[PDB]
Design a binder for this molecule. Sequence first.
Ligand SMILES: [Cl-]
Lengths: 97, 98
Amino acid sequence: SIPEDYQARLQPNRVEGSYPLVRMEFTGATVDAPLMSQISRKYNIDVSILSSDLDYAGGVKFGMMVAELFGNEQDDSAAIEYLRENNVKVEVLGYVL
Amino acid sequence: LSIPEDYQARLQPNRVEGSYPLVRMEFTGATVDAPLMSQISRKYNIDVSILSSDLDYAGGVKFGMMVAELFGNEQDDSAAIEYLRENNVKVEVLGYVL
Ligand SMILES: [Cl-]
């Protein structure tokens, strides 16, 4: 489920002037922390949230979020590995030009 | 419009020591097109602890709701809430979580 105007602009590889579009999955294995806040501060990422379907039930926060990550290549790569280190599953769908 | 049991039990009408606001934020096509959670995370040093979100993007518009606990100082969270409102996010302070 990716909006069609983002699809039309989605490329497989990173070109000049494009930014990663990610789908992030959260489960009861994901570290319990304000991770979007932390990468916003630590790596100078603007997390442009497109869609989310996160829920909290039975003591667990779970679901998915799709976001475009605005920053530079070094910073967005660092932020993606930080999220993976904290057990967010991150799929880099492509780069939005 | 639901809020998880365990949060409900801890949710107070007023701000006490060691409590933090729980907010419900509504996004419509009137909301400024900006990475607002990132912006308040930096500008006001707010940790946005997201409980639930139901945000969709269709037809050029992001819309829906997000419920989050806002961790920071009282001065900073009040400033961040006003910043969100100024950017046309509807913000309901549901209470304070102790
Ligand atoms: Cl946002």
